[PDB]
Each structure stands twice: as C-alpha cells, then as structure tokens.
Symmetry: C3
C-alpha cells in the first residue's frame, strides 16, 4: 500500500545519497 511505497522511496533516496558520495570521492579523493 502507500506505506510500502514510502518505504521504498526512502531506500531509493539512500541509494542516491550514497551514489552522490561515491561520485564526490571519484572527483576529489587525494
């Protein structure tokens, strides 16, 4: 139902935030 969808949004939003962190590291590490 709606609650299930909202829980999958939050997971997707955490997948995206981590991707953004990896992208930053690819550009700036070192």
């Amino acid at each position: 139902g709606i609650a299930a969808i909202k829980q999958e949004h939050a997971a997707i939003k955490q997948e995206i935030a981590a991707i953004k962190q990896e992208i930053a590291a690819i550009k700036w590490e070192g």
Copy 2:
C-alpha cells in the same frame, strides 16, 4: 497520498538525471 508519492518520484527522477550528467562529465570533460 498518491499525489505526494508522484511528487517524490519526479524529484528522485531529477536526482538521477543530474547524476547521469555528472557521470558523463567525469568520463568526457576535456
């Protein structure tokens, strides 16, 4: 409700499109 979920989909979809643009720049800039 459903409308709220659809508005968070559209935001997620814009987060992803920008990520794809940054990935392209990482590979091809210069």
Copy 3:
C-alpha cells in the same frame, strides 16, 4: 494508482543499478 507507482519504482531501481555499474567501471576498468 498504486500499480503505476510500483512500475515507476522498478524503473528507478533499474536506473540506479546501471548507474552503480558505470561508477564501478569508472573506478576499475583497465
């Protein structure tokens, strides 16, 4: 409706998995 939302989640989840594959290739190819 809910089914439509679930179909857009699955698409988003495939967009993310491919992004993760491209990120891995950027780091490790070669």
